[PDB]
Design a protein around this ligand. Sequence first.
Ligand SMILES: OC[C@H]1O[C@H](O[C@H]2[C@H](O)[C@@H](O)[C@H](O)O[C@@H]2CO)[C@H](O)[C@@H](O)[C@@H]1O
Ligand SMILES: OC[C@H]1O[C@H](O)[C@H](O)[C@@H](O)[C@@H]1O
Length: 492
Amino acid sequence: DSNMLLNYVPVYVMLPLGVVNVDNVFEDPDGLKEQLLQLRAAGVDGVMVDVWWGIIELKGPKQYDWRAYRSLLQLVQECGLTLQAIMSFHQCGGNVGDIVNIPIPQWVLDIGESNHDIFYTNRSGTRNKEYLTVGVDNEPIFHGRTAIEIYSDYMKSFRENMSDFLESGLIIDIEVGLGPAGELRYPSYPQSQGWEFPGIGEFQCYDKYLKADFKAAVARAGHPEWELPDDAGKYNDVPESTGFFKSNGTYVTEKGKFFLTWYSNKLLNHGDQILDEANKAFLGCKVKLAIKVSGIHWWYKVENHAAELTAGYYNLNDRDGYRPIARMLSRHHAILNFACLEMRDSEQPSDAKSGPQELVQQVLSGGWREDIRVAGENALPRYDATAYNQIILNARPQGVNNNGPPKLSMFGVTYLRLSDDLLQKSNFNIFKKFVLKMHADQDYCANPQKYNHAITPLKPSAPKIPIEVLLEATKPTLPFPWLPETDMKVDG
Ligand SMILES: OC[C@H]1O[C@H](O[C@H]2[C@H](O)[C@@H](O)[C@H](O)O[C@@H]2CO)[C@H](O)[C@@H](O)[C@@H]1O
Ligand SMILES: OC[C@H]1O[C@H](O)[C@H](O)[C@@H](O)[C@@H]1O
């Protein structure tokens, strides 16, 4: 058991969307309690929850109401579960699975009415109101504050008002929301605008701030006449139908490469700058910082990787678009939370040129190569053994080490999502086996220190890493070898 415990990978479960409604009311504590108690008995280590900005700071600037969430955290603590708190600076409602509508603060939306450019904008000019464009990160246009200061003040307020829960070790990590669905990405595949899998998506850098940023950048590059992509097609196009993504297309020209570098760099800096504020806000707290990276697996199997590119991940067969993110996270001692841990290529339609298995291997490998912790989540609801086995495989790519800790292991997996369906007899029985196998056949272990997941005070961010150094991580590397199947299947 001893050596097996060092192979233990913690399992968390996402709480239902809207547990705290838009009116900032913890609607059904009794119902939730019964569910959490079932998770506790099942061996689950903790749960994850969105701490919605649009709910908390709804009244106005710096008018936070943490009461309902304090009641939620209190219940979670009573149920013997830890918590992964997401600083959700995005809207719930327009992405897959969003069954509740929670917009960002109305007072922010009011400003957006006078300044439509605070929203990510596509070439056609459609404004996406689910998140504030990186373009206004440092624009003091929100009643004197910049978007990043809003995020900073929010996290500081969270840290002080939840000081008791933090001190007791209830919160294991702060998932810093960095864009749509809390992920560090552009809203390139908006269901709200008609996008449907596996559309290549669209670049979202047309708001006046980003556009001006781009124009200034190209001018300094000696090409002031360069314009943003105008041949990348539309949301539901396929790569070959566009002049930008077709073979020998614009994406490989000097202009295209410059744009893609600029576009993706905006995300790297966005995450770096906001994480700077997160390290400040939670300095000294016994919690770890983490960010979420979306798994854009469609088109991964074609040389243009169109969907990843429009999403802001400049990843190609000869350019690693994720390792730079991992390197950026290292200075913050932050965790890279990646999705698609449950997917297998065979489950995707052939016309999508989907490579979730390879993508996961690349991202996790890059994280470990950069010596950072990598965690993850299943992208879509799954209750089957096939899904759990794939997650367990990714959790320990080279299996269990009976002689000690595994060389490779994810830092944790958060399951989407707690629901009535999950708790049904058969589904829950399979889930319990999933938890057991993730735990390397060991019983639930209340003290993380036992499996080398000790919680220590968050330290200050290490020195800033120059963009040039961050981009050195674009150098392609071989992924770590993966077993074809886990050695710890939920069944046989
Ligand atoms: O509650 C967490 C977030 O869940 C959804 O976003 C998921 C998305 O469903 C999944 O496919 C992807 O892999 O991860 C994201 C983030 O966990 C909601 O759409 C978000 O609003 C929530 O914050
Ligand atoms: O809506 C976005 C989702 O579209 C599809 O379901 C993809 O399979 C999934 O990976 C992605 O997150």
